[PDB]
Amino acid sequence: SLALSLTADQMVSALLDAEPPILYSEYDPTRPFSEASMMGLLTNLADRELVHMINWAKRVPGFVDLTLHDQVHLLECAWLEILMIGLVWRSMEHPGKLLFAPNLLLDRNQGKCVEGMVEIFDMLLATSSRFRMMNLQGEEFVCLKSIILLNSGVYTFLSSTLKSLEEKDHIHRVLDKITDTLIHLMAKAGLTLQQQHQRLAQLLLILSHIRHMSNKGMEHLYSMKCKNVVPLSDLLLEMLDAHRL
């Protein structure tokens, strides 16, 4: 696998080149929101974003080396984390706001348009503030996002039997490379050795909270599904049924 031979700079370049585009919301033209309206827009966005994520994932070094089954498992487990860390990233420059799209910039209080969703907005906004307080760099962001894809579902790789062990070791090898890449970025930025380790710890611990937000978001989206407040795409329902059944 010519993923483990990449330089730290080549890792960065690959991830930057692999970046998905910032999609637009259909929010038209600007009618007052409702609960069904906002859920519609948000989920519609999510579905369109998912299609791009899948092609982005295929461009993450080492990912296409995995079996079809394992690629599916990784995306099923991590898809909402990947959306959320992306949302948080492009919301950095807009304190107290969530930039779902350039034409869909939501204040905190607009999360109250949907029952129970404002609490999820609050967690996303807090994460955005932490990124901003840390002065998170773009090259760092793409490293963290790739880490989420490879890390989130590797422990649930049921079948620790036979050539599934080879898979898990491969994923850990790539993860180490991305770790090296993060450290390289910090070393290049002029951070001392102690500063590097501290910042690495700081970034990765945020992924613990991103996991938490995803689990809560999954539960909310499921509750909205069952109440039929919003019709979800077949793709969304599949990603949602992966955390249920």
């Binding site: 299609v51 899948i54 092609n55 295929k58 079809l68 690629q71 599916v72 995306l75 099923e76 077949d234 793709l235 599949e238 990603m239």
Partner: peptide
């Protein structure tokens, strides 16, 4: 047979 399966190959 899932949609995800199809897009991974496409």
């Amino acid at each position: 047979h899932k949609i995800l399966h199809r897009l991974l190959q496409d």
